[PDB]
């Protein structure tokens, strides 16, 4: 194909060569040399770009702009060049089409500002920026010895093995981004990484006109993570943020290795320097100063892990599906069970030959066990139904009986396991054992038996250990229906004629699963805010900690705040802010000073003031700075100053202060039936300015005609421009108060003439970087951006004097106040629905609830868990978990912690208490056995003694004596059950028995174990002691007392870590969820084994 090359040197189809990414290049007709490329970085355009994806979404890698910059040097600065200070900003998420505009302009000689950006929906978004340099000297780094380098680095990291680990943090590298074959390292001291990279087959064909392929350059950035110091330290989501210097010394076609070097390695990020080598070891590209940090914070990682780790049992309303001999055994003979009578009659009624056994307590258990084993070998039976005797309200008694009930189930369970033939199906029937319907008050006794049947279903799965929770009102005809249907659910319940089925699942919600309360309106802190903007039904009243003000601040008792159009957007998430953080609802207020912070001479207590703050002014109490409040004149009230403040302010500033509104000059006021619009009409009228106004609604336009203003146009058009131009004989206006956007924003500028004063109050267009054409400014115009909100922060003394003059001007009566529609704080949602609909006219005021009336509030993470003004108790606090939380609680700022354990302080524990007592806070140690009642009273009395009320309890007390079903003794059950359950009832009783000191506690938590939920074989006794305690906690909550239970996994000092549980504990205490299950899940062996055996864990298999 020589012929082919000599053939080609002859014709010409009209085309031009372009870069794959950058795209079509045009140079702008303007001095200086300004360039502009426009190219698609879409997934349909460049399929290969879909293989790099974050959280299952294709995004543009850093390396993609690295190339874009490197490319852009040679066309701008016709020479060899470096790319300086390359920064990436927002993460470009890709679609089938994603157009991007690269733009490089010369600024100084051999220097050019480089910039990548994307325009969608009118919002320009700068995705990457740099400087380009062509004046730098070619100081080619010395070539390395590829083979020698590999000798110094023997520790081989497989590429795949590293790319699997990437997918766990959320970064996916598909087939195209699999270039990194392997990386060789040495130790944490040696800071280098040899990486054998290569461009994949699909892309070696598509190398086209790349300086360096982004897929390849990204493959070298992957190699930086292979380093041991990087794996050890920054063990989170690492993303590239920029590169200080990027130079290509030639063709990166033939690049087989990358030589990385770590500069700095920190928890925040990793700086590194790279060198792409060929087989000869000669440097082809040097990316020196690559920064890889973490935007996706270490706090959001914890929050996300916590959510995947929690488990709770949920009940589904189910129906009995589809379509042998039986034995109905009892656990109490002196108690006559109508359930056992009615079930034996319904099985014989259905046509099954059913026998009966009366195994009771205080009986010859060895003789009755032999009698049972004889009945099994005598006749082959399908199933065995174990009915448990009912007390037929005292918990103290149900806790003592609960042991005798468990011990009795262990004796029955051991005989059914030791069967010659096929063991029959076990159906344990309990009376209101656990909580299913929200209305239920659980009947204990049987509460502890759900842990044993869960352990028996795991140890001996031949007999499918099923549980059936039953109530009094239900009918025996429907109960036997379940026994003969043979459904595989191992945990079920019955309430009335409906049937309920258990199913395990993670549910870390924060809506109804959040703390609730009732608070006074005159006293106690209550703010109003949306939990998730967009939904107005999500508008909640929330409580806050009303604190002492100062220094140089004030706490104002609000009588009335306003509803500005700002406050509407915020509700819908549509609000722009320089801060970035979505502002808090309500800007201005009208109230009275409650407390003046140390130390200010201007403000005094009891003064009627009006101000601004942010921090949520739709509340009973607002803390504002001294700078941001001003005393009200005798002429206006708290409700009158609430409406006026920002509207008249924004207008005063705008028209008289900036634009210097003269008399007679023509002013345009967009949407003049609104708040700021009425205020505009007022000052424009005072001033004598000829008003030209707009409105969207014809009702609201005829409303402006009724206000004696001719020259009313549609605000939702660009017609007003040419309508006003005709209605002014081609003169146009003088001032434009521009609330309106885009074509209507540009149209206003085009309208006003010579005098030309454009007051832009509308943020949308500025925070979208709408590039306004300067041409009309040829007539001596003046653009004025306004952001009062920001001024409140930058120059608050202006905003103070502005609020002050508008309160004076209106109180004097210089300006008349506008349409004020008062609303109750409750119906603040409806104001937004109306204002959002544009139905309203003028200002809407929200009246704050006066009078000590109660309102249901919602404390989120303002819950005072660890507080100095309260006392704490920690049973089992001299070892293991309980002692770790005692050190963390003192550290968290707690006053008086009474630790306890039956054993005296251990030697390493006595050393931990010495160092904690020296560091401020006190750790009172009170020995005793929580099983004895006097011990729990002694602990409470000790914690209160130092004039501090009891604000929290923890139950880490436990005894773990594990054994297989065959060797679980009656004595061993008492040792595990006694501290777990008898300590809870004593701790419960001590709190009620105590005076007002203990009738104020915020929480009461019990440290259970996930082996109760799962059924770890060998636990049994310890698993049953926990199940009762999980139900007791739910009973304590039913009565009204606070109660919490956390089923903990496997602790360190794959597995639960020490600091992992402390943060998890504090999270769970702040929420109103009663039962919690913190345990490792991932793809464990015990979970995959449990999911396939029973349908309780159906959602885990997936």
Ligand X SMILES: NC(=O)c1ccc[n+]([C@@H]2O[C@H](COP(=O)([O-])OP(=O)(O)OC[C@H]3O[C@@H](n4cnc5c(N)ncnc54)[C@H](OP(=O)(O)O)[C@@H]3O)[C@@H](O)[C@H]2O)c1
**Cβ-contact 452, 409 below 8 angstroms:** yes
242, interface contact from ligand X, a second copy, none, CB < 5-8 Å by kind: none
The tokens describing 325, both together, are: 């001999």
User: Is residue 880 a known part of a binding site?
Assistant: yes
In the complex with a second copy, the residue whose CB is nearer, 373 or 770, is 770
User: Is residue 1007 a known part of a binding site?
Assistant: yes
Q: Which stretch binds a second copy (CB under 8 A): 172-180, 207-215, 503-511, 824-832?
A: 207-215
Q: Should residue 38 be labelled a site residue for a second copy when binding is judged by CB under 8 A?
A: yes
Q: Should residue 198 be labelled a site residue for a second copy when binding is judged by CB under 8 A?
A: no
In the complex with a second copy, the residue whose CB is nearer, 124 or 705, is 124
Q: Which of 2, 14, 551, 915 binds a second copy (CB under 8 A)?
A: 14
Q: Which of 11, 78, 551, 606 binds a second copy (CB under 8 A)?
A: 11
The tokens describing 72, both together, are: 């852009």
Q: Should residue 913 be labelled a site residue for ligand X when binding is judged by CB under 6 A?
A: no
Q: Which of 671, 1009, 1026, 1044 binds ligand X (CB under 6 A)?
A: 671
In the complex with a second copy, the residue whose CB is nearer, 166 or 767, is 767
Q: Should residue 806 be labelled a site residue for ligand X when binding is judged by CB under 6 A?
A: no
Q: Should residue 878 be labelled a site residue for ligand X when binding is judged by CB under 6 A?
A: yes
Compute how many other C-beta atoms are within 10 angstroms of the C-beta atom of residue 244. Answer: 17
762, interface contact from ligand X, a second copy, none, CB < 5-8 Å by kind: ligand X
Among 156, 294, 308, 289, which residue's Cα sits nearest to residue 226? 156
| Shortest distance, position 1087 Cβ to ligand X, whole Å | 24
Q: Per-residue x/- mask for ligand X, residues 947 to 976, rule CB under 6 A? A: ----------xxx-----------------
The angle subtended at Cα 949 by Cα 945 and Cα 953, nearest 5°, is: 100
| Shortest distance, position 91 Cβ to a second copy, whole Å | 19
Collapsing DSSP states into helix, strand and coil, what is residue 1038?
A: helix
Q: Which of 134, 170, 552, 696 binds ligand X (CB under 6 A)?
A: 696
671, interface contact from ligand X, a second copy, none, CB < 5-8 Å by kind: ligand X
Collapsing DSSP states into helix, strand and coil, what is residue 982?
A: helix
Tell me the sheet residues that pair with 562: 845
Breaks (C-N over 2.5 A) in the chain follow: 323, 392, 1053
Q: Should residue 1009 be labelled a site residue for ligand X when binding is judged by CB under 6 A?
A: no
For the chain, the straight-line distance linking the first and the last C-alpha, in angstroms and rounded, comes to 58
Q: Per-residue x/- mask for a second copy, residues 73 to 112, rule CB under 8 A? A: ----------------------------x-----x-----
Cis peptide before 243 (omega within 30 of 0): no
Query: Helices in 424-501 by DSSP H: which ranges?
Result: 449-459, 476-485
The angle subtended at Cα 538 by Cα 537 and Cα 540, nearest 5°, is: 110
In the complex with ligand X, the residue whose CB is nearer, 284 or 886, is 886
Q: Could you say which of 40, 218, 490, 734 is catalytic?
A: 218
**Cβ-contact 887, 862 below 8 angstroms:** no
| CA 796/CA 836 separation, integer angstroms | 29
Q: Should residue 628 be labelled a site residue for ligand X when binding is judged by CB under 6 A?
A: no
User: Is residue 878 a known part of a binding site?
Assistant: yes
Q: Which stretch binds a second copy (CB under 8 A): 160-168, 306-314, 752-760, 822-830?
A: 752-760
Q: Should residue 674 be labelled a site residue for ligand X when binding is judged by CB under 6 A?
A: yes
Q: Which of 762, 895, 1020, 1049 binds ligand X (CB under 6 A)?
A: 762
Q: Which of 774, 856, 904, 960 binds a second copy (CB under 8 A)?
A: 774
Residues 6 or more apart whose Cβ sits within 8 Å of residue 836: 568, 571, 572
Q: Should residue 676 be labelled a site residue for ligand X when binding is judged by CB under 6 A?
A: yes
Locus of tokens 């009762």: 1028
| CA 723/CA 934 separation, integer angstroms | 90
User: Is residue 930 a known part of a binding site?
Assistant: yes
In the complex with ligand X, the residue whose CB is nearer, 429 or 704, is 704
**711 catalytic per annotation:** no
User: Is residue 902 a known part of a binding site?
Assistant: yes
Q: Which of 2, 6, 29, 351 binds a second copy (CB under 8 A)?
A: 29
In the complex with a second copy, the residue whose CB is nearer, 15 or 851, is 15
| CA 483/CA 463 separation, integer angstroms | 14
Size, binding site for a second copy by CB under 8 A:
73
780, interface contact from a second copy, ligand X, none, CB < 5-8 Å by kind: a second copy
564, interface contact from a second copy, ligand X, none, CB < 5-8 Å by kind: ligand X
Compute how many other C-beta atoms are within 10 angstroms of the C-beta atom of residue 22. Answer: 25
Collapsing DSSP states into helix, strand and coil, what is residue 621?
A: strand
| Shortest distance, position 774 Cβ to a second copy, whole Å | 5
Encode burial over 1075-1085: b for 16+ CB neighbours within 10 A, e otherwise: bbbbbbeeeee
777, interface contact from a second copy, ligand X, none, CB < 5-8 Å by kind: a second copy
Q: Should residue 136 be labelled a site residue for a second copy when binding is judged by CB under 8 A?
A: no
| CA 970/CA 630 separation, integer angstroms | 76
Q: Should residue 1 be labelled a site residue for a second copy when binding is judged by CB under 8 A?
A: yes
| CA 541/CA 332 separation, integer angstroms | 52
Q: Should residue 75 be labelled a site residue for ligand X when binding is judged by CB under 6 A?
A: no
**Taken in order 967, 971, 975, 978, is the CA torsion positive or negative?**
positive
Q: Could you say which of 46, 52, 213, 460 is catalytic?
A: 52
Among 665, 641, 655, which residue's Cα sits nearest to residue 587? 641
Cis peptide before 1064 (omega within 30 of 0): no
Q: Should residue 10 be labelled a site residue for a second copy when binding is judged by CB under 8 A?
A: yes
Compute how many other C-beta atoms are within 10 angstroms of the C-beta atom of residue 94. Answer: 22
Crossing angle of helices 449-459 and 1021-1039, rounded to 10°: 150
Among 832, 575, 821, which residue's Cα sits nearest to residue 678? 821
Q: Which stretch binds ligand X (CB under 6 A): 389-397, 423-431, 675-683, 726-734?
A: 675-683
Q: Which of 328, 624, 931, 1043 binds ligand X (CB under 6 A)?
A: 931
Collapsing DSSP states into helix, strand and coil, what is residue 447?
A: coil
Dihedrals φ, ψ of 391, to 5°? -65, -60
Collapsing DSSP states into helix, strand and coil, what is residue 250?
A: coil
Q: Please report, as residue ranges, which positions from 577 to 596 form the binding site for a second copy (by CB under 8 A).
A: 578
Locus of tokens 């926990």: 1026
**469 catalytic per annotation:** no
Size, binding site for ligand X by CB under 6 A:
43
> In angstroms, what CA-CA distances link 913 with 872, 887, 1090?
16, 8, 42
Q: What residue is closest to ligand X based on CB?
A: 674
| CA 1088/CA 251 separation, integer angstroms | 51
Q: Please report, as residue ranges, which positions from 135 to 174 form the binding site for ligand X (by CB under 6 A).
A: none
In the complex with ligand X, the residue whose CB is nearer, 312 or 564, is 564
Q: Should residue 566 be labelled a site residue for ligand X when binding is judged by CB under 6 A?
A: yes
| Shortest distance, position 49 Cβ to a second copy, whole Å | 15
Q: Residues forming the annotated binding site for NADP(+)? A: 878-881, 901-904, 929-930, 1007-1008
**Which residues have a catalytic role annotated?**
52, 218
Q: Residues forming the annotated binding site? A: 878-881, 901-904, 929-930, 1007-1008
């Amino acid at each position: 194909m020589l012929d082919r090359e000599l053939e080609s040197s002859a014709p010409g189809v009209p085309s031009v060569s372009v870069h794959p990414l950058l795209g079509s290049h045009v140079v702008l007709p303007q001095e200086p040399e300004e360039h502009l490329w426009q190219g698609d970085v879409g997934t349909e355009a460049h399929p290969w770009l879909s293989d790099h994806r974050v959280h299952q979404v294709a995004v543009l890698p850093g390396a993609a702009y690295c190339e874009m910059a490197l490319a852009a040097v040679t066309p701008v600065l016709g020479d060899t060049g470096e790319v300086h200070d390359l920064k990436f900003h927002d993460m470009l998420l890709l679609d089938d089409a994603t157009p991007v505009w690269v733009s490089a302009a010369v600024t100084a000689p051999g220097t050019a500002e480089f910039g990548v950006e994307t325009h969608q929906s009118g919002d320009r978004t700068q995705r990457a920026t740099a400087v380009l340099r062509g004046d730098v000297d070619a100081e080619r780094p010395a070539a390395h010895s590829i083979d020698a380098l590999l000798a110094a680095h023997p520790n081989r990291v497989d590429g795949d093995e590293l790319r699997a680990g990437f997918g766990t943090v959320g970064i996916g590298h598909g087939a195209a981004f699999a270039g990194l074959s392997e990386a060789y390292v040495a130790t944490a001291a040696e800071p280098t990484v040899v990486a054998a990279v290569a461009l994949p087959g699909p892309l070696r064909s598509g190398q086209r006109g790349y300086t360096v392929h982004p897929a390849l350059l990204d493959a070298c950035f992957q190699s930086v993570i292979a380093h041991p110091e990087v794996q050890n330290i920054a063990s989170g989501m690492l993303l590239p943020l920029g590169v200080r210097r990027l130079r290509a010394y030639g063709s990166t076609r033939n690049v087989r290795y990358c030589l990385s070097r770590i500069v700095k390695a920190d928890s925040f990020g990793v700086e590194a320097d790279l060198e792409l080598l060929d087989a000869d070891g000669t440097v082809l590209l040097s990316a020196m100063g690559l920064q890889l940090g973490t935007g996706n914070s270490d706090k959001a990682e914890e929050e996300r892990l916590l959510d995947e780790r929690l488990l709770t049992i949920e009940w589904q309303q189910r129906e009995l599906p589809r379509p042998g001999s039986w034995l109905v055994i009892l656990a109490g003979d002196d108690d006559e069970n109508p359930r056992a009578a009615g079930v034996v009659s319904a099985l014989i009624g259905a046509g099954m030959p059913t026998t009966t056994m009366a195994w009771s307590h205080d009986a010859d258990h060895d003789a009755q066990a032999a009698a049972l084993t004889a009945r099994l070998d005598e006749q082959p039976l399908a199933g065995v139904a174990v009915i448990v005797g009912d007390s037929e309200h005292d918990v103290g008694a149900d806790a003592r009986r609960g042991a005798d009930h468990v011990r009795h189930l262990v004796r029955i369970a051991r005989t059914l396991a030791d069967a010659v033939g096929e063991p029959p199906r076990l159906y344990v029937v309990t009376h209101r054992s656990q909580h299913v319907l929200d209305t239920d008050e659980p009947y204990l006794e049987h509460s502890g038996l759900r842990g044993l049947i869960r352990v028996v279903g795991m140890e001996h799965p031949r007999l499918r250990a099923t549980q059936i929770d039953v109530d009094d009102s239900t009918a025996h005809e429907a109960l036997v229906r379940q026994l003969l249907s043979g459904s595989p659910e191992d945990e079920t319940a019955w309430r009335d004629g409906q049937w309920y089925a258990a199913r395990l699942c993670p549910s870390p919600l924060r809506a109804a699963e959040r703390r609730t309360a009732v608070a006074d309106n005159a006293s106690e802190g209550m703010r109003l805010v949306v939990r998730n903007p967009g939904d107005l039904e999500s508008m909640e009243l929330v409580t806050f900690e009303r604190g002492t003000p100062g220094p140089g601040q004030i706490e104002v008792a609000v009588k009335a705040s306003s509803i500005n159009f700002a406050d509407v957007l915020v509700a819908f998430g549509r609000c722009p802010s320089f801060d970035g953080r979505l502002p808090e609802l309500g800007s201005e207020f009208g109230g009275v000073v409650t407390a003046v912070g140390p130390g200010v001479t201007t403000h005094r207590v009891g003064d009627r003031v009006g101000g601004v703050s942010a921090n949520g002014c739709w509340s009973n109490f607002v803390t504002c700075e001294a700078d941001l409040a001003t005393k009200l004149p005798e002429g206006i009230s708290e409700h009158e100053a609430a409406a006026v403040g920002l509207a008249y302010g924004t207008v005063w500033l705008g028209l008289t202060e900036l634009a210097r509104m003269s008399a007679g000059d023509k002013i345009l006021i967009h949407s003049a039936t609104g708040g700021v619009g009425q205020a505009a009409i007022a000052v424009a009228r005072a001033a004598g300015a000829e008003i030209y106004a707009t409105a969207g609604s014809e009702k609201r336009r005829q409303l402006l005609r009724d206000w004696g203003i001719e020259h009313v146009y549609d605000s939702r058009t660009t017609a007003f421009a040419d309508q006003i131009r005709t209605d002014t004989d081609g003169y146009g206006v003088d001032i434009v108060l521009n609330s309106v956007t885009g074509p209507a924003q540009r149209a206003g500028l085009e309208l006003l003439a010579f005098g030309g004063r454009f007051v832009e109050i509308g943020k949308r267009d500025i925070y979208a970087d709408t590039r306004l054409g300067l041409f009309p400014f040829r007539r001596n115009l003046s653009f004025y951006a306004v952001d009062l909100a920001l001024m409140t922060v930058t120059h608050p003394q202006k905003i103070r004097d502005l609020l002050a003059t508008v309160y004076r001007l209106i109180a004097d009566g210089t300006l008349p106040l506008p349409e004020i529609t008062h609303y109750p704080l409750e119906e603040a949602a409806t104001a937004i629905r109306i204002m959002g609909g544009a139905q309203h006219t003028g200002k809407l005021v929200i009246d704050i609830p006066d009078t000590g009336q109660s309102q249901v509030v919602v404390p989120p993470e303002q819950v005072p868990v660890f507080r100095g003004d309260g006392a704490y108790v920690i049973t089992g606090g001299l070892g293991g978990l309980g002692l770790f939380l005692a050190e963390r609680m003192a550290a968290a700022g707690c006053g008086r912690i009474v630790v306890n354990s039956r054993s005296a302080p251990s030697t390493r524990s006595s050393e931990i208490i010495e160092l904690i007592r020296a560091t401020g806070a006190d750790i009172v140690v009170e020995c005793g056995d929580i099983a004895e009642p006097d011990t729990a009273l002694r602990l409470v009395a000790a914690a209160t003694q130092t004039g501090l009320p009891l604000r929290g309890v923890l139950h880490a007390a436990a005894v773990v004596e594990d054994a297989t079903l065959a060797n679980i003794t009656d004595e061993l059950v008492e040792h595990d059950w006694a501290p777990k359950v008898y300590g809870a009832w004593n701790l419960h009783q001590a709190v009620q028995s105590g005076g007002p000191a203990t009738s104020e506690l915020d929480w009461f938590c019990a440290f259970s174990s996930a082996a109760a939920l799962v059924g770890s074989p060998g636990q049994g006794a310890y698993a049953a002691a926990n199940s009762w305690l999980d139900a007791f906690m739910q009973w304590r909550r039913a009565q009204g007392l606070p109660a919490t239970s956390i089923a903990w996994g496997a602790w360190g000092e794959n597995a639960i870590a020490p600091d992992e549980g402390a943060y998890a504990f504090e999270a769970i205490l702040r929420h109103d969820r009663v039962y919690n299950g913190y345990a490792p899940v991932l793809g464990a062996s015990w979970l995959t084994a449990f999911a396939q055996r029973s349908p309780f864990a159906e959602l885990f298999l997936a």
